[PDB]
Amino acid sequence: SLLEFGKMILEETGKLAIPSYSSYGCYCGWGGKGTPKDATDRCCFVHDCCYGNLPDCNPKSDRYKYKRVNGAIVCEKGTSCENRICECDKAAAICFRQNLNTYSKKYMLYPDFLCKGELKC
């Protein structure tokens, strides 16, 4: 769920999910249109695609468990939906950590009309 996902992101990057990653570029958040603006936005795009691979799961509400093994994220064993949701989130959190260097505030609250072009998962 968004509860577990927010806490991972905070742990990983030290930024709060809302407002740092809830309205960033074209894909972090609500969004789903156009060309991702930068590496961080790409993390969100791949994360959206990841959720897209799960039809009959509910990523926003479905709760999974995970533990830290010296920093490493380890998804604990639940339903198959919970397992796969946790892996999508884990990949996003790390992707975020990897790209922190190029995170730009210029992309926060990015306007919809500038979210142009197309990209297939």
Binding site: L2, L3, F5, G6, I9, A17, I18, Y21, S22, C28, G29, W30, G31, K60
Partner: peptide
Amino acid sequence: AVYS
């Protein structure tokens, strides 16, 4: 909480 909700990154959507």
